[PDB]
Amino acid sequence: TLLGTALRPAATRVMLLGSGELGKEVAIECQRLGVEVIAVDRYADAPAMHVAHRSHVINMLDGDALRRVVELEKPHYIVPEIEAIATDMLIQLEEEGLNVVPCARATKLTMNREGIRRLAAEELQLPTSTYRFADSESLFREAVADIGYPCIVKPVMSSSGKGQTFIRSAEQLAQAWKYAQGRVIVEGVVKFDFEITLLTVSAVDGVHFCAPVGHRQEDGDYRESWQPQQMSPLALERAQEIARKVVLALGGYGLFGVELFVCGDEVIFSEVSPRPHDTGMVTLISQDLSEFALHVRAFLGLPVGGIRQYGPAASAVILPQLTSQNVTFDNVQNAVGADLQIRLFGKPEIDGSRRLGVALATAESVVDAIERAKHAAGQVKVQG
Amino acid sequence: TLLGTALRPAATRVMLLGSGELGKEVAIECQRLGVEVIAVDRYADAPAMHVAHRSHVINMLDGDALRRVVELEKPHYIVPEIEAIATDMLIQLEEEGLNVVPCARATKLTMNREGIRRLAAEELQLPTSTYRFADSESLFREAVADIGYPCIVKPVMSSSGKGQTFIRSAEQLAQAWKYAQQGGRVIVEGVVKFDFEITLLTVSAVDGVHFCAPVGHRQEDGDYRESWQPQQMSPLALERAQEIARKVVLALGGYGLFGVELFVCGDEVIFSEVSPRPHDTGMVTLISQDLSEFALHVRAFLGLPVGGIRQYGPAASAVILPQLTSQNVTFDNVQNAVGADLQIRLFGKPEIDGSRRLGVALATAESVVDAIERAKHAAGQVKVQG
Numbered sequence: 001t002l003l004g005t006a007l008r009p010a011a012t013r014v015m016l017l018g019s020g021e022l023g024k025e026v027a028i029e030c031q032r033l034g035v036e037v038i039a040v041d042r043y044a045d046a047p048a049m050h051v052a053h054r055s056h057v058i059n060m061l062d063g064d065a066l067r068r069v070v071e072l073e074k075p076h077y078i079v080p081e082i083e084a085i086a087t088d089m090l091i092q093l094e095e096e097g098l099n100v101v102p103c104a105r106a107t108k109l110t111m112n113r114e115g116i117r118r119l120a121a122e123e124l125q126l127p128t129s130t131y132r133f134a135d136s137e138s139l140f141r142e143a144v145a146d147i148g149y150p151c152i153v154k155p156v157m158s159s160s161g162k163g164q165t166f167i168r169s170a171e172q173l174a175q176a177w178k179y180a181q182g183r184v185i186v187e188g189v190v191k192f193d194f195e196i197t198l199l200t201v202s203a204v205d206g207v208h209f210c211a212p213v214g215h216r217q218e219d220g221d222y223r224e225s226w227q228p229q230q231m232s233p234l235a236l237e238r239a240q241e242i243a244r245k246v247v248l249a250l251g252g253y254g255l256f257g258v259e260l261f262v263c264g265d266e267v268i269f270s271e272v273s274p275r276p277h278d279t280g281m282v283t284l285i286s287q288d289l290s291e292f293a294l295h296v297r298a299f300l301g302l303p304v305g306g307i308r309q310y311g312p313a314a315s316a317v318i319l320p321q322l323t324s325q326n327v328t329f330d331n332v333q334n335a336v337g338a339d340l341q342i343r344l345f346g347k348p349e350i351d352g353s354r355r356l357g358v359a360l361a362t363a364e365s366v367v368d369a370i371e372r373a374k375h376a377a378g379q380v381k382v383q384g
Numbered sequence: 385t386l387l388g389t390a391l392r393p394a395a396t397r398v399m400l401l402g403s404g405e406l407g408k409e410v411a412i413e414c415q416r417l418g419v420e421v422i423a424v425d426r427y428a429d430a431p432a433m434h435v436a437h438r439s440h441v442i443n444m445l446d447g448d449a450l451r452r453v454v455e456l457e458k459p460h461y462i463v464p465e466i467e468a469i470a471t472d473m474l475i476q477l478e479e480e481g482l483n484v485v486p487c488a489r490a491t492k493l494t495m496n497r498e499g500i501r502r503l504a505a506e507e508l509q510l511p512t513s514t515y516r517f518a519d520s521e522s523l524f525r526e527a528v529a530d531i532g533y534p535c536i537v538k539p540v541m542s543s544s545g546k547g548q549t550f551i552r553s554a555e556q557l558a559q560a561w562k563y564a565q566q567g568g569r570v571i572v573e574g575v576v577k578f579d580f581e582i583t584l585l586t587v588s589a590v591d592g593v594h595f596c597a598p599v600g601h602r603q604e605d606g607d608y609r610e611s612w613q614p615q616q617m618s619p620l621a622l623e624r625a626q627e628i629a630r631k632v633v634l635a636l637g638g639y640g641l642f643g644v645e646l647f648v649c650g651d652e653v654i655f656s657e658v659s660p661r662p663h664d665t666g667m668v669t670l671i672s673q674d675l676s677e678f679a680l681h682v683r684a685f686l687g688l689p690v691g692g693i694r695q696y697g698p699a700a701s702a703v704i705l706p707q708l709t710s711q712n713v714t715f716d717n718v719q720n721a722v723g724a725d726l727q728i729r730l731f732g733k734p735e736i737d738g739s740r741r742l743g744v745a746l747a748t749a750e751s752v753v754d755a756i757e758r759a760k761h762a763a764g765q766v767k768v769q770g
């Protein structure tokens with residue numbers, strides 16, 4: 001691995017496709033290595049742009065626009081930070097010689113619930129929920145019958161529950177199908193003891209895992225996350241096995257977020273993000289290398305070696321709901337202290353619910369860490 | 385404490401005067417809280433400029449130039465990152481309403497050895513080396529004669545060991561003086577034969593004075609080469625060092641993190657000098673603590689309570705200090721410079737013309753000895769080309 005000096009002719013260039021809080025941390029990690037960072041997003045002054053060398057505002061779903069930006073900057077690494085990008089152009093560009101992290105195919109496959117679910121369930125032969133594909137209210141209708149209730153519905157092009165529907169009732173199918181709007185996937189409910197994110201890094205020295213991350217979701221948003229999630233060694237063994245198979249099948253170097261359901265000693269694969277994952281923001285205080293630092297280490301072709309975990313830790317989001325273009329944060333003095341920090345993203349405005357920052361905490365117990373982080377997030381007064 | 389959103393009208397604005405590797409991390413910690421950062425230096429594309437919202441290049445020793453940039457950017461905080469700045473202008477501006485971190489008087493006393501040395505020794509009655517000042521060669525010679533051999537001569541305004549000479553005999557007198565003219569008044573100090581030297585990173589904040597665990601360090605050519613933490617000290621030595629550091633910071637005044645350099649002789653502690661801001665040796669804290677010295681400086685100056693500092697165990701830093709001339713530096717063999725419990729930082733400095741600290745290796749281990757070896761070895765593996 002040879003790195004140039006940012007801004008100099010031999011500079012090593014990284015292009016972020018998506019500049020939110022996740023990309024912000026990736027950017028800092030690149031910067032820490034003198035790596036040149038070009039932050040791209042669909043709006044100006046996105047978090048990652050504040051810490052990048054330069055930025056571009058474009059419609060990332062527009063393949064032609066993406067090719068132009070890429071051609072213009074000639075990056076050595078194309079690092080997707082969100083799902084919503086023109087994966088097809090990534091494939092083409094990769095084919096043209098461009099380095100897409102972890103690989104273009106992994107981006108495409110995971111973007112579509114159909115590709116990924118078939119790969120894992122079928123090809124890889126791993127445990128998943130019961131599933132089905134349909135392409136019409138009729139098909140929806142007949143599928144949802146196949147699944148039965150309880151049951152889940154998601155566009156094959158859904159995120160953060162975007163267009164998802166939890167179906168216990170026949171009445172919903174009015175709502176359901178419309179909300180889903182295209183085409184969809186219908187899954188049969190898993191009753192797990194808990195869910196985890198197994199952050200798995202694929203690098204030159206093989207695949208390494210972070211301690212399991214537990215989390216609480218609410219209204220399609222993670223609220224809190226913690227590490228390490230308590231689970232059996234047997235269960236952990238199984239989870240690791242599932243994660244390795246998945247990451248190796250997707251291919252390429254990077255940090256992946258493997259979503260799994262845990263039922264006693266059994267583990268079931270749900271999905272996977274071929275990039276750093278929100279719940280993993282706890283690693284900003286819980287490990288020597290954050291998931292962001294791990295991603296960069298991996299993609300640059302550098303070895304990981306190991307990952308140190310610093311005891312019970314948690315993250316708790318700062319998720320206000322208001323409309324403003326000049327947000328201020330008061331009472332900060334009561335949101336920081338021993339074993340407690342906060343991050344404020346730099347998002348330019350808000351109009352509805354939006355993740356503007358995160359609280360991070362460590363404690364003697366996971367329960368205590370969660371509380372310290374939750375309390376700290378609650379102390380911040382978000383003004384408009 | 386209220387913070388705005390960077391780039392927005394109510395933004396909280398921080399101006400760094402000096403944009404080296406130290407300011408770079410201060411900038412990153414500001415950015416992590418959505419603090420708007422303006423990076424100023426004497427050259428373009430300085431490290432902190434890479435991670436700042438806006439940058440400016442001016443003569444920081446020119447008070448009028450300083451006033452123009454501050455007037456232009458209207459920062460809420462002026463955060464000097466180096467000693468060589470127009471400190472009288474900072475006093476002026478502070479009077480005019482600006483918040484200078486930690487305070488303008490602290491910057492003024494420490495930018496010139498005479499201010500701080502006389503304060504510490506004379507006013508605070510802290511233990512220090514013997515010393516004399518001199519502004520002519522003849523007086524310099526009288527000074528050396530009174531001080532005795534060996535002694536160290538240094539320009540009153542200097543850092544990283546520039547213009548200094550370890551004087552062992554009269555034979556060096558002439559070149560030493562000259563050389564102290566390349567890098568004005570000078571200080572002549574008696575040599576303290578210490579067992580080891582430390583940097584006690586001391587944070588003065590809204591919730592009091594807090595101390596990081598002692599950071600040991602090895603200097604060469606008066607420039608740091610390796611640092612580690614914790615440095616073992618007797619209970620008595622640690623208590624004395626803390627007392628000294630507490631006195632210095634409170635005397636200098638204002639919130640911020642200060643790098644208090646001390647010499648240790650068994651259970652006795654002697655004061656050397658202090659940075660009224662993050663310290664180079666303190667870069668070990670990038671791996672060794674929950675909150676790095678940069679994060680602590682920011683926390684403090686923003687008026688937030690520190691609460692406490694967590695130390696992860698034995699760790700060390702080792703500099704990446706090549707020697708060449710180039711304006712297009714590359715770093716190869718990076719795959720042999722990082723791994724388990726091992727990291728590096730490459731600063732983004734635009735060029736080199738001789739020796740220049742371009743990066744740092746960081747490591748953790750079960751002992752500082754092992755940590756130091758791992759960091760040194762990694763720094764060494766880096767293939768610097770240009």
Ligand SMILES: Nc1ncnc2c1ncn2[C@@H]1O[C@H](COP(=O)(O)OP(=O)(O)OP(=O)(O)O)[C@@H](O)[C@H]1O
Pocket residue numbers: 129152158159160161162164187188189190191195217259270271
């Ligand atoms: N078959 C299922 N059984 C039980 N719960 C499920 C199932 N499918 C999804 N969930 C629940 O829905 C949550 C979000 O749905 P899912 O992870 O499948 O996709 P998503 O909405 O696109 O989220 P993401 O933002 O991670 O892409 C999961 O974290 C889990 O709590």
Ligand SMILES: Nc1ncnc2c1ncn2[C@@H]1O[C@H](COP(=O)(O)OP(=O)(O)OP(=O)(O)O)[C@@H](O)[C@H]1O
Pocket residue numbers: 513536542543544545546573574575576577581603606607645657
């Ligand atoms: N009186 C003294 N006795 C013994 N050693 C000393 C004395 N003064 C300085 N040194 C040695 O030289 C090193 C550098 O000296 P000093 O800190 O004064 O220089 P500097 O140019 O101000 O460096 P910087 O500001 O970057 O720390 C010390 O850390 C110590 O190793």
Ligand SMILES: NCC(=O)N[C@@H]1O[C@H](COP(=O)([O-])[O-])[C@@H](O)[C@H]1O
Pocket residue numbers: 018019020021022023081082160278354355
């Ligand atoms: N759950 C996915 C996730 O956390 N994505 C993160 O949020 C950004 C968008 O935030 P925004 O919608 O507020 O602009 C993305 O850019 C990414 O950093």
Ligand SMILES: NCC(=O)N[C@@H]1O[C@H](COP(=O)([O-])[O-])[C@@H](O)[C@H]1O
Pocket residue numbers: 402403404405406407465466543544663664733740741
């Ligand atoms: N002990 C002082 C010290 O470490 N100063 C650090 O070195 C920079 C200058 O480096 P440069 O000479 O390579 O430009 C300063 O800006 C500061 O960060």
Ligand SMILES: [Cl-]
Pocket residue numbers: 207208209210
């Ligand atoms: Cl592992």
Ligand SMILES: [Cl-]
Pocket residue numbers: 465466467468543
């Ligand atoms: Cl300095």
Ligand SMILES: [Cl-]
Pocket residue numbers: none
């Ligand atoms: Cl960090």
Ligand SMILES: [Cl-]
Pocket residue numbers: 001719
């Ligand atoms: Cl190799």
Ligand SMILES: [Mg+2]
Pocket residue numbers: 158159160271
């Ligand atoms: Mg998804």
Ligand SMILES: [Mg+2]
Pocket residue numbers: 259271
């Ligand atoms: Mg999910």
Ligand SMILES: [Mg+2]
Pocket residue numbers: 542543544657
């Ligand atoms: Mg000094």
Ligand SMILES: [Mg+2]
Pocket residue numbers: 645657
């Ligand atoms: Mg010194």
Ligand code: NA
Pocket residue numbers: 099100101102103252253
């Ligand atoms: Na690749």
Ligand code: NA
Pocket residue numbers: 483484485486487488638639
């Ligand atoms: Na002040």
